[PDB]
Design a protein around this nucleic acid. Structure first.
Ligand SMILES: Nc1ncnc2c1ncn2[C@@H]1O[C@H](COP(=O)(O)OP(=O)(O)O)[C@@H](O)[C@H]1O
Ligand SMILES: Nc1ncnc2c1ncn2[C@@H]1O[C@H](COP(=O)(O)OP(=O)(O)O)[C@@H](O)[C@H]1O
Ligand SMILES: Nc1ncnc2c1ncn2[C@@H]1O[C@H](COP(=O)(O)OP(=O)(O)O)[C@@H](O)[C@H]1O
Ligand SMILES: Nc1ncnc2c1ncn2[C@@H]1O[C@H](COP(=O)(O)OP(=O)(O)O)[C@@H](O)[C@H]1O
Ligand SMILES: Nc1ncnc2c1ncn2[C@@H]1O[C@H](COP(=O)(O)OP(=O)(O)O)[C@@H](O)[C@H]1O
Ligand SMILES: Nc1ncnc2c1ncn2[C@@H]1O[C@H](COP(=O)(O)OP(=O)(O)O)[C@@H](O)[C@H]1O
Ligand SMILES: [Mg+2]
Ligand SMILES: [Mg+2]
Ligand SMILES: [Mg+2]
Ligand SMILES: [Mg+2]
Ligand SMILES: [Mg+2]
Ligand SMILES: [Mg+2]
Lengths: 309, 309, 309, 309, 309, 309
DNA sequence: TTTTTTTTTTTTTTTTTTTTTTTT
């Protein structure tokens, strides 16, 4: 899928240089190709001359030019989608959650945002012919609501062994925004050794709310958030995984999501959740580059997300 | 349990540094590990190149990284749950009140919110064999309804010596929101010396209602409340105690709890109380990450909360 | 349309000099005539007494002097306008999108900026008698929202063949600001071999946000952006194409476009988009040298941009 | 109103010397009278002795000495002023735009700088008894915003014939700063053959911004600009025309014009524009040798600049 | 006042010698006394053994030797001082502008430098009792900002007849630096026939900026400027008049006057002007041999320079 | 302190020879003894015989031979040292300005060079017990900055009577370089009839710059300057007075004094001035035969040079 | 064989928050 970063060791580029690059956070040749020159010179040990040759070798292995739209159409026809467990939602989304972009879920409390993430963390492991991804899951939790018992219950409905299902999920907790950003380097390091398919951030704005307080700290908060979103997009470009994030709401003094224009402009797809009758929930498509606006109904059960019975 | 803060005395850090840190409000190595760097560059005497040292230390002692979900599942099966005195309530809660998270109780007047807190203040001192926690209780009051004469009667039912029961509860009264926030530092200091198991806040919104008035002060109220909730969650993370808070209701213009979206998103479990016939009452699960919705019946007697006769 | 650069090989200029000029990014005689002397001296091979000869010959081939306003009036009556697919919008613009200048579209999320670009990428290929351009399209994407499926649906409505329509669009993705500026040399190389009529940049400011962070890098950011805008205008002068760019908005601490005074002064026409009822949207003329301020309504359908139904 | 340069061949000077002078860029006897000797001894062919004869002969035809202030008052009380189409503006300026000096207009985008230039290009042709000039216009454009449709619309309001109006304006487009300076020699050549009354430069600093970049090229940029301003003032002295230039603004890191101290000291009159309500605009006098500070209001209509209802 | 030159005609000196001296710019006996023998021998028709007697004579008429400081104090106590029209300014300067020395004013655009010169050109004619000088004014303008209209208004405020005020000012315009130096011979010739009391040079540095461009011509520029300043001082010594000159500023790449050390060392008094609130301006003493540093406030009105209110 | 020239009257010598020598400019036997025989030849009236006799005489009256270093060391102990009015300066200079040598001060404009000379002109009359010289002062001015009011103010601070203080200073003004050289003969004649202690030249290079312009005339300027400095040193040797001179600076294309190597080698002590905060100034030792290189601080007040508070 | 001089010039915006309270 990607080009190993060891193939950049020619014409006087040694292994110590590659070790310095890995210590900086780059783990593939694509990561080197996508970075600007001013970024590479902020590493203690990389002189101006090398920074040029490094950029010349990477471009020979990673294509960056012009193609026709027919070629891009053919390539895009081969991306896989992940099933949500509900037929209504799969039809509404055009197949499921798609790899290579960012999907956002928002709503008020107990509307079902964490249950769907739990369901996807299982369906990302199953065979491709039933809507799976045949990969692993990386889960980052900023609120403390992750529950392995739900995973154990869900894995039985899809014919899995609970031991392997629990072994194939990597989990981490974050305590402030700097730690939240720091964890992405470890994620990138782990992604280059085995095959993953999904990343979850639940939720993305909870710690920013209190780490920066009031007017007078707004600009710095928005700048930090923009850096985080750019890093997530770069990971999706490098490894071809799906990315899912959650968000909270506030009242207009009737409810709207938080994070402002930075949040609104950088998400590929946006979905809104609402509370229904009993165990039923309502879903609406709020933003998309290729889908119309519409609505549907789903339900929460002991074994996960499904269709109303 | 935790790691003493005195272990951050390896290199270039003197007892004066730890004294300054303890002045700032930190009494554990976890507290230093969980704080952002921008927060450390605010204590007179710590400037730079030292905050970066205290951060490198306490990460070797306190883990912050990825694990498997099977390890997390094994660790979570060791948490303690405290009995409520009623079989139906314990069955509905999946065991009782669980350490490490936040539970909220809401309802209209004389629905039984304070009697349950009084009963929990006793059940947390008894041995783990019968559903206790073998620890002390910290009780903060903002309405003036704490009555030590109920504790004597309740303790006489569980085979406790009344004088020991009364000596093992710490009590404080608050007069405004700033005082309420300030008491938490003293709580942390006390918890770093002896062993505690439970914390009660009764009630959390009573003083906010009158300290801030009108739409022109609404934004400043919610930020203060968010800071308070974050501090409570940090204490629960540090010491592994249970946290219980109470809340009032209002009319729509049929009744809903006060506090807005900050309150609704920051709580882990939510329970609603209603009035029944005679001494009986009804309880309902309104929000939870691993339990379905259901209801049961309990009763109030001269010896505490129990099952209907 | 343009004078080929091979006509400059006279009176001592050989093929090696033209090869060096081409490698430096010049592909037409007009490009040589528009460059200052200080620019030519910075190319290896051109020393002196040769740049002067090149400039004299280019001025002989390309006119740069005074004419009467009647001649310019006659010449400007032969410019082509491209239809947007909506009659209200075409009337509001005096005919459509005009070749030889720069048009800017700004608004908040999901207001319809990318859908109009997709529609224009098809209408630039149809015959002149129905508002087409009879040429090819070049598309540069910095956000990853280009979707070939919309082109098939839009091409079906205008009587085009989908395979031919997909073969006549050239597509490229950019990953940082240096790469974005670099792609224009390849664009200029491609335009001198076959006929194009439209260029799209979607969007112009997305990567500048994160590549330059905070105050202290603001001047360098603005200077880089000024260079990019000047290159776009030079391409429009050289080849007689239409240029369309998109832009994001920010809050005033009620919304305004980003990019400052450089962006405000560099654009020829400026249009603002707003969200309406259902699938309807509103457009407003914010700046123009020959049109008054006015407003209209348009709509988004499965087959593109059109009039309300 | 000027002495032809053919009067200098009296005793010892021939037609070849005058041809050399004309090729170097001198077209009147006043031009020879105002040039320093070091400049004359720089044309191929002209040596000493001859360079000493011309300088003497010119002094006999162009007076350079002391006079009384009463005589200067009498002469200055016979200068033409050009109407702007608005009565408020004419009152604020003391009659209109003054021949023999330099006027500068600055402001942010779409504040009306180019519309007033378009109106003046028409009013410079009408008879003297209604505020006109009975002359021709020369227009230099560095941004590409010149539109003859506005001229056709404006000429009808004043009773002119549109074909005559279009035949009496000379137009040129500049592509870099060297070309911009080079066009003034052709301007002088043209002005020595027919009667003109106005010159427009719109705008003056647009190409300097990008032709020189950064700290290391600031001195050369300012020196080039000083030469351009001196040449403009020389033309105004030579032929008795009015000179109008436009300028852009930047933010103070609330807005100020660009060009430094050279521009600020070189202009005779300075006016600032601001955006009002609907089609209304505000004008302020920022610098002048004989007028106090004050403000007024004007408006833009389909037929040019006028009074607010 | 001064000793006429005709008195030199003794001991075999004819009128032809005196005419030859007058043709070279010498118009008094003090001028011949102040000149060195080397300069004298550069005149055609005056050779050795003639300069010997020319220098021997004029030493009996003009004294050049030693005296006591008390006598010089007595002589200096009889120097006229002109009034600026403002009491704060007259107090800050010790009485007004002093005859026999050089005063320089510097500042940025529209700080009031030319208005004060216009006011002095009137106050130099009023009787000695009210602070005048009872003489004529000589005015040299290099920028083109002289306005006789202000003189009428200013004269109406001091009880003067406007026509006589306008007839008592001599005005000249300079077109390059050689012409600027040439005009001083005519000034000296005029001053030997009628009584003058003030000389004005408005922007002594404006033409030097462009006449010598860039490094490589700096030495010649400074040498020419030094000659001009020396001639000004000689005139002030010869006729006992006051001398006022103006100057521009540049940015320190927070502003400083131009001209270098040659200008800084040859000015007796230096004053800096700054912009205030409304029509108010601030003045500061920057250099002087007998005054301390201080500040004051003045204002500009339709009748000239005056007190803040 | 000197042998009168009238003491050289012996056999073969008459009054006419002494009168002729006095006319030439020799006033003491030391001057005749120090004059090489070649010099005593252009004096019309003395060719041979007389010159040899005069040289033989004054050898017995003035010692010309070898002495022990101890005798010279003892004789050097009877040297006066004038106070500068500042304690820091007196400490840095080792006591004050010393008689018998040459001191030079240099710096930029308004650095305090003339104020110190004014103060010395007064302190040179104070009694020896408090650092005086009990003599008169000779002042030569080439710029026109001498102000007796400062002397009157300074006299009171030291207990002197201003009427008497003004009568003990001789003042002269120089108009060109030849006159500047000529004044020294009169100075020497004056010093042979009364007791003087100080001599001041302010400044020494102001007229040389303009009397000799540019290259080609160089080295004649330098020969003239060398002669002037040799004459100054001869006076200092003859009469045992202190000598002080001033100097200007130029920029290096950070500033350096003017005069070349002649001035650099001829001076005995060199001091540099710099501007400080408020009325404070900084002094630096740049050259001295027997002193280290240190710094100091002083200030200027209404009564002269003093300590920085 | 000889003997140093003399300063200049401004640039360029960013970025949302947060519910209240029964009546006959
Ligand atoms: N085992 C279970 N069986 C049925 N419903 C459950 C179970 N666990 C949780 N739920 C339901 O899921 C809801 C919580 O949804 P969640 O995704 O945690 O909300 P949020 O949108 O805040 O993330 C609760 O209303 C609860 O009733
Ligand atoms: N000793 C007691 N015996 C029986 N019932 C009691 C006793 N003390 C209080 N109660 C009951 O408890 C109720 C008070 O409930 P409480 O928890 O204080 O209400 P809230 O929900 O406002 O906190 C009263 O209705 C009262 O009847
Ligand atoms: N196939 C389709 N049919 C109908 N509407 C669509 C279709 N695809 C996208 N849309 C609508 O277009 C809108 C997105 O507009 P777009 O131009 O991508 O926004 P932006 O202004 O951010 O570029 C969405 O609201 C979506 O509902
Ligand atoms: N034909 C017209 N009728 C009415 N208003 C017009 C017409 N043409 C242009 N305008 C108005 O003039 C303004 C453009 O001002 P302009 O002078 O070009 O700006 P700038 O100050 O940038 O030069 C626009 O806001 C536009 O609405
Ligand atoms: N008749 C007048 N009445 C009031 N103020 C005037 C008049 N004429 C000129 N001014 C003011 O004088 C100022 C110009 O000052 P000036 O001395 O010309 O500046 P500079 O320092 O550039 O020479 C302007 O700001 C203007 O407002
Ligand atoms: N009477 C006074 N009171 C206070 N300060 C004065 C007085 N006279 C002159 N000065 C200060 O002395 C300084 C002039 O120093 P001076 O020695 O003349 O400079 P230079 O080094 O050019 O000769 C000025 O800055 C001035 O402020
Ligand atoms: Mg939630
Ligand atoms: Mg209650
Ligand atoms: Mg968008
Ligand atoms: Mg504009
Ligand atoms: Mg000015
Ligand atoms: Mg000085």
């Amino acid at each position: 899928s990607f080009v190993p970063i060891e193939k950049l060791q020619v014409n006087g580029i040694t292994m110590a240089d590659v070790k310095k690059l890995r210590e900086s956070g780059l783990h593939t040749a694509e990561a080197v190709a996508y970075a600007p020159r001013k970024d590479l010179l902020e590493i203690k040990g990389i002189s101006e001359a090398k920074a040029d040759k490094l950029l010349n070798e990477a471009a020979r292995l990673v294509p960056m030019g012009f193609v026709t739209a027919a070629d891009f159409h053919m390539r895009r026809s081969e991306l896989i989608c992940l099933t949500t467990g509900s037929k209504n939602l799969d039809t509404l989304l055009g197949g499921g959650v798609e790899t290579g972009s960012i999907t956002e879920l928002f709503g008020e409390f107990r509307t079902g945002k964490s249950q769907l993430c739990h369901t996807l963390a299982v369906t990302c492991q199953i065979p491709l012919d039933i809507g799976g991804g045949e990969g692993k899951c990386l889960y980052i939790d900023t609120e403390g609501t992750f529950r392995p018992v739900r995973l154990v219950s869900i894995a039985q409905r899809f014919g899995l062994d609970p031991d392997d299902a629990l072994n194939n999920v990597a989990y981490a907790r974050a305590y402030n925004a700097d730690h939240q950003l720091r964890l992405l380097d470890a994620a990138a390091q782990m992604m280059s050794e085995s095959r993953f398919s999904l990343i979850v951030v639940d939720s993305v704005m909870a710690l920013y709310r209190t780490d920066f307080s009031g007017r007078g700290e707004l600009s710095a908060r928005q700048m930090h958030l923009a850096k985080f979103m750019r890093a997530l997009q770069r990971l999706a470009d490098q490894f071809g995984v799906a990315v899912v994030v959650t968000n909270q709401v506030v009242a207009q003094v009737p409810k709207k999501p938080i994070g402002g224009n930075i949040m609104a402009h950088s998400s590929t797809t946006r979905l809104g959740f609402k509370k229904g009758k009993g165990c039923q929930r309502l879903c609406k498509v709020v933003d998309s580059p290729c889908l119309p606006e519409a609505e549907c109904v789903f339900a929460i059960y002991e074994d996960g997300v499904g269709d109303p019975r």
